[PDB]
Design a protein around this ligand. Structure first.
Ligand SMILES: *P(=O)(O)OCC(C)(C)[C@@H](O)C(=O)NCCC(=O)NCCSC(=O)CCCCCCCCC
Ligand SMILES: Nc1nc2c(ncn2[C@@H]2O[C@H](COP(=O)(O)OP(=O)(O)OP(=O)(O)O)[C@@H](O)[C@H]2O)c(=O)[nH]1
Ligand SMILES: Nc1nc2c(ncn2[C@@H]2O[C@H](COP(=O)(O)OP(=O)(O)OP(=O)(O)O)[C@@H](O)[C@H]2O)c(=O)[nH]1
Ligand SMILES: [Mg+2]
Ligand SMILES: [Mg+2]
Ligand code: NA
Ligand code: NA
Lengths: 38, 236, 37, 51, 152, 329, 112, 142, 419
């Protein structure tokens, strides 16, 4: 592995990314155990 | 022809035993074209005369030299690299027990042989050093200067490490690498205890030295030929 | 000393479980203060 | 592990031992998940001479 | 290097063999999804390469009369293939044949292990076919003897 | 040490007694020295007739000096398994060469604590020449870690033998998996017996004399006469049983205590089924008290006397008057 | 997991003879395992240190006839099986009458 | 368990063994002979004298100390060690780097090309053999 | 080595070539002694270990087959390779049953070209026959120096005669030492920039990079080693890079082949190779004290003459693949090198390749630019541009107008026998 590796060697996008990530964290059933303050 | 097959197997096994009678448990070295310095039986006297140590943070040392050269200086440098690979490579790994050393003869034209040094850090780039022997310096001092250069390179590579704590930890948890060295223990001893029998060894372990035999007191008394403050029996 | 840090990691989960339970009780008792007042 | 016999000394490699428990283990309460839409819990309480 | 008719016939034979192999895998439980399909493919391709090499060596009116013998040899090989297919189709009923197919699909041991199981499969099927006849005629003989004894 | 003068005499041995031969599946446990061959044989053997008899096992190089055969039972499969001495000095003994050639199959057992020395490569290629069915069984599987199983098992698959079987003789794991591999051979050998049983019956109806005498051997249903040969060490009793069978079946060397596991051999003498059972050399208590392992081997010697039908005690006649301990026997 | 196997994570109390005793023995000259003797005191340690030899000659040095070079009769002790008993036996060297040939005088000469 | 040691001895005359048909030792030659042999047969007939530096000096040969009986072997292993040490002291040139690599001084023998005089065309060998995931798609609005 | 860079997209076709029965690896010893300039590729190739036999897994579709056949020097293994090649080609053609055919009027000129080539055939086969009887020399040693010359050893004999014409020892390796791939790609990008301002691609396609990794012999994969290319590999790479970087449409493959052959001539030119080549350690930054970054002129001239020699055998080997009906005949009767890299480029493609090659070679001989100096001059580049665009347009407009040029240019490039 060593030998082979040495031989080989406010934007709208981010805003909508935050929107999608927050919606996922809110509506996901895996995160249903999130504390109420969070 | 079954008896002939059995005879062939016996002959092959007899040759194998003649080759590795004291060399059964160690692994076999790489069967390359430049690593001929490993399959040969090394004299322990020569290995003791050639004792050289490198920085503890290095893990791999390879040398690459061409088989056929075009220039006179290229032939000289290739001869220097070959002499170094045949003289100082095996002592380095045998006396460091941490580094893996390898030599290679490339079937091409390369007037400048080189040596690569890999440290214990996986993210750190290896150090490459070309063999440029001075024309005025003979082969002996040229090989000596090459050895000094590679030792200084290993020292720099080990001093430029990122995290010495993790370097030392991976050094501790790295297995052995000098298992392939075939050495002939000649008139010096078979086991390190008999080898260093002329020196007091204070580095021991209590649970290791504790014998586990039945009636160990009786056996130790018999071995020491010591009375043990025990009254003699009848003896009359 | 590193094995000692591994012992805390086993019980550190439960100490976090106790804090969040009261944090839920503090935020819920705040909601009923707005509903009834 | 405690010694199993007294006649044989600790020097014998064939010494037999027996395991005896010091603590049966550690236990913690079980706390189920609390729903958000139903935080209010209703229960019945039976008390005998408790204020 | 092989005539088109022979190529078509051997493709039909290999298709039938693969159909029978998958049918066996689905009917009796083969614990691997690949099963004996890969082993059958390897063996058939090896025999195909061997026969093609033999045909290349034989190509050297003598060639015309040898082509007929080679075609008849290939026809016999394909009839043996059909027999193998029928035996595999009847295999799921018997328990030993299923175990043999399972060990051939798993591929444990050396080649001589798999070869002895491969070659002896047809012989074991024929042995089971003859066992019923032998035991039936023996039971009929014993029944006739017992009847003629009861008459005496 | 084999010499042309010695090997010429062995060829002139005439069988005093006829070996019965194997009528069931034969499997030889082939492997290296101290690889768990005897321990694997203990889990597989099942002899309710001689319960005290077992295969000796110890974490030492060269515990099994001589081969031993016995009946084994595994998931309703009746067959016999042969224990073979490990490759000593990187070579097999002559008693083990002729023994593994009689077996139908073989189980190549290898341990993972030590790498594959060039001796197994010689033995594996030796079994390749005989065209014998061999299965690779990786013993001592419990020593390997979970994250290391994929590395070692990829190597055992590259030795020509496909899909090596993981097995642990101590934890008895993989026993139900080794049984499934032997299932086809059991039905195969059962197929060979009945077909050969049909051939020997047609010749009997023809009038062949060699076929009628063979049927009478199978038609003979009598209780076995277990005849054991016991005696003091260095007395020649193992060398005697080799003269009975007609070849060097057991090992017989000048050094004392060359047999460490009793060996049983089914034979037929004048139409009487009998079993010649080798035994280890008995010894006094003042010689076996300090020597613990010899006391265990002597324990297996006295046990075979309790189940032997006819005991034949041998003693060195060159001494003249027999030994005092030989009378106590 | 087996409860009868000692837990490798824990560590039992050290029981064997300590660094002090082992270092004292190895500095006296005996091997480190030699600390496994029986009932040693100051005088027994002085005796087992070997500073003086427990040997002698069959005759006084002025009355010696057989040639002995660096040879002294020794005493080997062997403790019995059970306990507390020992057998002490003397051990004599291998006297072999050498019959050599002298270069100064012709005829050979023999001497024990 | 002391093995049979062989001692060095300086011969004074060309001794020819009649039985085996060879020379025991040339004149002024240092031979490793049996102890009993030298003591009972060679010494009395004055055919050889013990090899010592003073004997070499008296005979005029170049002095050399073989260190006889310096390490009295109590075991064949120690005897082998002593013989190896004596062999080294005799030929230190046997244990140099150039002699250790005399076989590989020209390179790999497999790499070296050797001329062939002849061969039988029927010895050629011609054998043929049989030669037989998923991820996620992440989109970013831009 | 009939055509450097004549590569086509095709599936991998594996084959297990025998190596020897252990422990007597006789053929392996022969390979170690003979395959020295290609031992890097030999070690890079995968090894297959049977129960008691050893096999090398070689891909016939790749350049590995031709590379082994050129340096084989072992008659039985090379004849078995030849037979396997021709048999699998016959089977693939029989299974395809639909090869692309060229225009019949174009194949007539190429058919008439084979008439004048038989004389040069008779001369070059005599050159190949004397090299076969030179096995006793320690340089090149064959197994049978008295056996009759056959069809399969044409590559070995041609390489031996090229070495004898170069008269310098190990010219191929001496050139690979000074020819590294990175600087070659950089200067080839510079050349395609100088030739086409905007009509050149920004880079090479990834599929074509995979194809080139398939068709180029692999070097050592060590940390300090640098990828180095033999002069033949450099010529092939130049031709393929040109013919794949030119932005001519796929329907006008003639212009792409013309660009490829122009690049091939640029590569085979000695002065261009000397100007482009640099030392590998100089490129990597290891050694800079030699100051010898220039390629040896004698070795350059020798390795260029190596590719210059033997045009007739290459022309006939390509005419074999020009038509499949004549391929089945000439594969086992006349001279033919059955390379799998030429089969996917069927009749039309290979005929356009032959036409572009002869036109480019004749234009090269007419200019004589390989004589004076400095192929990188603006006047010469503009002449090349005008030539290639004129030839492409003339081929697209009228077939006979360029067929007459092809005929005269063939007569010019391959001269008739003189005494
Ligand atoms: P394509 O059409 O180009 O391929 C055609 C092939 C088949 C390659 C022919 O060129 C060819 O090789 N033809 C002659 C060979 C032939 O017909 N072979 C038929 C094989 S019969 C046979 O014996 C194979 C049976 C193997 C069965 C294995 C059973 C295993 C069960 C456990
Ligand atoms: N961990 C582990 N040890 C085993 C296993 N099987 C055998 N051993 C050990 O291996 C050692 C030798 O056991 P044996 O059964 O005598 O092996 P053997 O091949 O018959 O030995 P020889 O007759 O001398 O060749 C003993 O310590 C056994 O406990 C196993 O499956 N796992
Ligand atoms: N002189 C002579 N020696 C014999 C004869 N038969 C056997 N021996 C020798 O007796 C010795 C002992 O042989 P074994 O067969 O191993 O005797 P054993 O009783 O099985 O020995 P243990 O297994 O150790 O108990 C060997 O050296 C034999 O060669 C004989 O008939 N005459
Ligand atoms: Mg055993
Ligand atoms: Mg015995
Ligand atoms: Na053992
Ligand atoms: Na004996």
């Amino acid at each position: 592995l060593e030998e082979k590796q040495s031989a080989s060697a406010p934007p709208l996008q981010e805003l909508v990314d935050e929107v999608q990530s927050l919606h996922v964290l809110l509506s996901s059933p895996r995160y249903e155990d999130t504390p109420l303050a969070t | 022809a079954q008896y002939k097959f059995i005879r062939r197997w016996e002959l092959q096994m007899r040759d194998e035993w003649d080759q590795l009678e004291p060399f059964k448990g160690l692994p076999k070295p790489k069967r390359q074209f430049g690593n001929e310095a490993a399959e040969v039986i090394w004299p322990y006297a020569l290995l003791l005369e050639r004792v050289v140590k490198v920085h503890p943070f290095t893990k791999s040392i390879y040398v690459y030299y061409a088989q056929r050269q075009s220039t006179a200086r290229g032939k000289l440098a290739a001869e220097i690299a070959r002499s170094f690979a045949r003289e100082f490579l095996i002592p380095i790994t045998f006396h460091n027990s941490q580094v893996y050393t390898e030599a290679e003869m490339l079937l091409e034209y390369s007037e400048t042989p080189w040596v690569v040094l890999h440290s214990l850090d996986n993210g750190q780039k290896p150090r490459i050093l070309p063999v440029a022997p001075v024309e005025g310096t003979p082969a002996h001092t040229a090989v000596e200067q090459l050895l000094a250069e590679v030792v200084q390179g290993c020292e720099a590579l080990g001093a430029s490490v990122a995290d010495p704590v993790t370097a030392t930890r991976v050094l501790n948890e790295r297995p052995l690498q000098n298992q392939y060295v075939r050495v002939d223990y000649q008139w010096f001893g078979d086991t390190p205890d008999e080898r260093a029998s002329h020196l007091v060894r204070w580095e021991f372990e209590p649970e290791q030295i504790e014998p586990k035999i039945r009636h160990r007191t009786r056996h130790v008394l018999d071995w020491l030929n010591y009375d043990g403050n025990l009254p003699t029996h009848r003896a009359v | 000393r590193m094995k000692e840090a591994e012992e805390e990691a086993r019980y550190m989960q439960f100490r976090k479980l106790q804090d969040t339970f009261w944090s839920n009780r503090k935020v819920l008792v705040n909601r009923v203060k707005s509903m009834y007042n | 592990l405690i010694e199993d016999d007294a006649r044989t000394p600790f020097s014998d490699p064939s010494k037999s031992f027996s395991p005896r428990v010091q603590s049966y283990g550690e236990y913690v309460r079980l706390t189920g998940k609390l729903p958000r839409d139903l935080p209010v819990l209703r229960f019945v309480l039976y008390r005998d001479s408790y204020s | 290097s092989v005539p088109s008719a022979i190529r078509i016939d051997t493709r039909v034979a290999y298709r039938r063999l693969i159909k029978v192999a998958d049918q066996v895998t689905r009917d009796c439980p083969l614990y691997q999804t690949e099963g004996l399909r890969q082993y059958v493919g390897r063996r058939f391709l090896e025999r195909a390469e061997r026969n093609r090499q033999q045909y290349r060596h034989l190509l050297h009116q003598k060639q015309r009369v040898l082509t007929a013998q080679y075609g008849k040899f290939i026809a016999k090989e394909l009839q043996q293939v059909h027999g193998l297919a029928e035996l595999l189709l009847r295999a799921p009923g018997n328990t030993a044949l299923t175990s043999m197919l399972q060990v051939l699909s798993a591929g444990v041991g050396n080649v001589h292990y798999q070869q002895t199981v491969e070659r002896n499969y047809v012989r074991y099927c024929q042995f089971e076919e003859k066992k019923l006849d032998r035991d039936e005629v023996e039971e009929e003989a014993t029944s006739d003897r017992q009847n003629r004894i009861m008459q005496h | 040490k084999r010499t042309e003068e010695q090997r010429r005499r062995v060829a002139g041995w005439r069988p005093v007694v006829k070996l019965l031969g194997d009528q069931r599946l034969r499997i030889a446990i082939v492997g290296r020295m101290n690889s768990g061959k005897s321990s694997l044989f203990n889990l597989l053997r099942l002899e309710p007739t001689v319960p005290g008899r077992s295969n000796v096992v110890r974490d030492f190089d060269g515990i099994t000096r001589d081969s031993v055969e016995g009946q084994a039972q595994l998931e309703g499969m009746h067959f016999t398994i042969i224990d073979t001495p490990g490759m000593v000095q990187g070579r097999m003994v002559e008693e083990a060469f002729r023994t593994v050639e009689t077996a139908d199959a073989a189980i190549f057992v290898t341990a993972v604590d030590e790498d594959i020395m060039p001796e197994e490569l010689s033995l594996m290629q030796y079994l390749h020449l005989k065209h014998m069915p061999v299965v690779l069984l990786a013993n001592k599987m419990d020593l390997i870690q979970e994250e290391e199983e994929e590395a070692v098992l990829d190597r055992y698959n590259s030795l020509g033998f496909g899909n090596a079987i993981p097995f642990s003789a101590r934890r008895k794991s993989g026993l139900e998996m080794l049984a499934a591999v032997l299932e086809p051979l059991y039905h195969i050998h059962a197929m060979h017996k009945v077909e050969n049983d049909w051939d020997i019956e047609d010749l009997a109806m023809q009038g062949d004399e060699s076929a009628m005498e063979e049927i009478r051997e199978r038609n003979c249903s009598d209780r076995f006469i277990r005849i054991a040969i016991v005696g003091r060490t260095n007395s020649g009793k193992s060398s005697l049983v080799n003269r009975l069978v007609g070849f060097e079946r057991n090992r017989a060397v000048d050094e004392k205590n060359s047999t460490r596991d009793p060996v049983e051999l089914p034979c037929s003498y004048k139409g009487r089924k009998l079993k010649l059972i080798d035994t280890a050399g008995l010894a006094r208590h003042r010689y076996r008290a300090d020597r613990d392992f010899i006391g265990r081997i002597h324990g297996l010697s006295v046990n075979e006397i309790r189940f032997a039908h006819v005991v034949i005690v041998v003693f060195d006649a060159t001494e003249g008057h027999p030994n005092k301990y030989d009378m106590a026997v | 997991f087996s409860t009868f196997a000692l837990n490798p994570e824990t560590s039992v109390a050290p029981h064997g003879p300590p660094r002090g005793l082992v270092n004292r023995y190895v500095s006296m000259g005996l091997p480190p395992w030699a600390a496994w003797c029986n009932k040693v005191n100051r005088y027994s340690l002085y005796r087992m240190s070997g500073v003086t030899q427990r040997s002698f000659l069959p005759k006084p040095p002025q009355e010696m006839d057989v040639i002995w070079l660096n040879e002294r009769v020794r005493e080997r002790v062997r403790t019995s099986r059970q306990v507390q008993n020992v057998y002490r036996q003397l051990k004599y060297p291998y006297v072999k009458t050498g019959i050599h040939y002298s270069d100064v005088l012709d005829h050979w000469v023999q001497v024990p | 368990q002391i093995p049979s040691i062989r001692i060095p001895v300086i011969f004074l005359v060309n001794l020819f063994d009649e039985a085996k048909g060879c020379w025991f030792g040339r004149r002024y030659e240092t031979v490793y002979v049996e102890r009993q042999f030298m003591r009972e047969e060679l010494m009395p007939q004055r055919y050889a004298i013990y090899a010592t530096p003073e004997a070499y000096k008296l005979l005029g040969l170049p002095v050399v100390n073989h260190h006889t009986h310096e390490e009295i072997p109590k075991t064949p292993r120690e005897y082998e060690k002593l013989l190896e040490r004596q062999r080294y002291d005799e030929e230190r040139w046997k244990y140099t780097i150039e002699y250790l690599f005399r076989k590989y001084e020209d390179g790999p023998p497999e790499l070296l090309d050797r001329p062939e005089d002849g061969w039988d065309g029927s010895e050629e060998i011609a054998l043929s053999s049989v030669a037989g995931x998923x991820x996620x798609x992440x989109x970013x609005x831009x | 080595p009939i055509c450097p860079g004549l590569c086509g997209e095709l599936a991998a076709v594996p084959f297990r070539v025998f190596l020897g029965t252990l422990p007597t690896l006789a053929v392996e010893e022969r390979f170690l002694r003979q395959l020295q300039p290609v031992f890097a590729w030999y070690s890079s190739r995968k090894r297959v270990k049977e129960q008691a036999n050893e096999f090398i897994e070689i891909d016939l579709a790749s350049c590995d087959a031709e590379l082994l056949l050129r340096y084989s020097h072992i008659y039985y293994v090379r004849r078995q390779l030849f037979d396997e090649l021709i048999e699998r080609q016959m089977t693939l053609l029989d299974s395809g049953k639909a090869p692309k055919m060229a225009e019949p009027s174009l194949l007539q000129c190429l058919a008439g070209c084979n008439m004048t080539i038989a004389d040069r055939l008779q001369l070059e086969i005599r050159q190949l026959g004397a090299a076969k009887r030179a096995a006793s020399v320690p340089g090149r040693r064959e197994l049978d120096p008295v056996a009759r010359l056959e069809v399969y050893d044409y590559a070995c004999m041609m390489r031996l005669v090229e070495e004898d014409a170069g008269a310098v020892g190990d010219a191929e390796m001496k050139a690979r030492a000074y020819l590294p791939r990175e600087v070659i790609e950089s200067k080839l990008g510079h050349l395609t920039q100088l030739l086409l301002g905007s009509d050149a691609r920004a880079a090479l396609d990834k599929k074509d990079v995979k194809l080139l990794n398939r068709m180029i012999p692999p070097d050592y994969t060590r940390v300090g080693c640098v990828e180095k290319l033999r002069p033949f590999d450099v010529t092939a790479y130049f031709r393929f890079y040109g013919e794949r970087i030119n932005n001519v449409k796929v329907e006008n493959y003639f212009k792409r082949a013309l660009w490829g052959h122009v690049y091939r001539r640029f590569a085979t030119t000695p002065s261009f190779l000397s100007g482009v080549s640099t030392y590998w350690a100089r490129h990597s930054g290891l050694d800079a004290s030699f100051t010898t970054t220039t390629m040896p002129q004698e070795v350059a001239v020798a390795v260029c003459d190596q590719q210059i020699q033997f045009p007739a055998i290459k022309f006939r080997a390509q005419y074999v693949y020009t038509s499949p009906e004549t391929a089945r005949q000439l594969w086992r009767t006349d001279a033919a090198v059955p390379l799998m890299r030429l089969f996917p480029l069927m009749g039309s493609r290979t005929a356009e390749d032959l036409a572009a090659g002869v036109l480019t070679d004749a234009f090269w001989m007419h200019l004589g630019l390989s004589e004076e100096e400095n192929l990188l001059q603006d006047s010469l580049l503009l002449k090349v541009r005008r030539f290639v665009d004129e030839v492409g347009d003339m081929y697209e407009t009228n077939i006979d107008s360029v067929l007459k040029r092809v005929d005269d240019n063939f007569k010019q490039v391959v001269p008739q026998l003189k005494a």
